[PDB]
């Protein structure tokens, strides 16, 4: 068990390549901690383990209004995608910066659910975008990596200020 | 398209002269814009960087490079909230280092037809204006760095 902190850029732990999970029983506590941490944010809808400094390939998502529809993805991978479009994204690890990012709008993701059983999600919903964002975190990528150098400097400046001025 | 000078070049250290006749510098403004838009990566350009002593700056922070900002006789009249931020410079190519700037500024200037302009900003534009305006008094951002860092800068420029 752990108290998890959401890390913010620039922090090299956000750039680590995640490790595949080979012992699903061993990550149940982390999954519940990740869910609690996501549910403690005002606005977050997903969270990836590298964002709390853990190297396991684990993502949690909850798109629901009441936050009672948790989705847990272990070892997720995009196995098909098509129909790229631009859409605004923000990130708990790049707080207070938002920009349009290109993603597939139809995707199939394969993973294990939290009990270790095979999971295959086929979606053209906003969930497709959210899964791609979270899966990017597992390869140490942030959405600002797709932007121009000027926009990346703009983002880092905004993050630094938001983090410095955050209230307790 | 004009040529951008690199340090060490005493023309980068010239104190710029105020512009009193806006019509006579209209050709230079378009020349500065063409020269900036011919760079791979630049977002602003000051007249001393093309060997001219007139107090003129051009800036474009847009993705498509279709929102030029032209500043004649620009002056920082207020600033607050100094912070460190990375800068690079077309006149110190391939050198990047953290430098202190105001993150909230008020700049007074004239637009390209001479009417008064007052820009109050806490955005990234604040940094770019300060960097460009520094060029007009013959300052490069490396002047604010330690001697060891300045020594390094000169080596990097030469290799470019
Ligand atoms: C949009 C694609 C990614 C969503 C996941 C992120 C959280 C995150 O960084 N996951 O790695 C999020 O909730 N981002 C929020 C976000 O961008 N949201 C919240 C839902 C709508 C959208 C507004 O841009 C911000 C406010 C932190
Ligand atoms: C950053 C504040 C001032 C920037 C202005 C300079 C140009 C300059 O030398 N003006 O006198 C620029 O475009 N610099 C570029 C720069 O540092 N950039 C380009 C946009 C983002 C940032 C780092 O990538 C380099 C690559 C030449
Ligand atoms: Ni994110
Ligand atoms: Ni410069």
Residue numbers in the entry:
A (entry chain G): 13 to 180
B (entry chain D): 15 to 174
What's the paper's own text on this?
Peptide deformylases (PDFs) are metalloproteases that catalyze the removal of the formyl group from the initiator methionine, a critical step in the N-terminal methionine excision (NME) process. Most PDFs share a common catalytic core defined by three conserved sequence motifs (I, II, and III), which coordinate a metal ion and position key residues for substrate processing. All peptide-based PDF inhibitors share a common mechanism of action: they bind to the catalytic pocket of the enzyme, thereby preventing substrate access and inhibiting its deformylase activity. Furthermore, our investigation of V. cholerae, which encodes two type 1b PDFs with 50% sequence homology (Def1VCH and Def2VCH), demonstrated that both PDFs are catalytically active.
In contrast, the accessory PDF, Def2VCH, is encoded on chromosome 2 as a monocistronic unit. However, Def2VCH shows a specific pattern variation in the amino acids, described in E. coli, as responsible for ribosome binding. We found that Def2VCH specifically confers reduced susceptibility to the natural PDF inhibitor, ACT. To explore this possibility at the molecular level, we determined high-resolution crystal structures of both proteins in complex with ACT. In both structures, ACT binds in the same location within the catalytic pocket and adopts a nearly identical orientation and conformation, blocking access to the active site located at the bottom of a deep cavity in the protein core. In contrast, Def2VCH exhibited a different binding pattern. This is mainly due to the substitution of arginine 97 with a tyrosine, which weakens the interaction with ACT by abolishing important hydrogen bonds between the NH1 and NH2 atoms of Arg97 and solvent-exposed oxygen atoms of ACT (namely O20 and O27). Additionally, in the hydrophobic pocket containing the ACT P1' aliphatic chain, isoleucine at position 86 and leucine at position 125 in Def1VCH are substituted by glycine and phenylalanine, respectively, in Def2VCH. These substitutions likely contribute to the variation in ACT binding affinity between Def1VCH and Def2VCH, explaining their different capacities to confer resistance to this inhibitor. Conversely, substitution of tyrosine 97 with arginine in Def2VCH led to a marked reduction in the MIC, aligning with the resistance phenotype observed for Def1VCH.
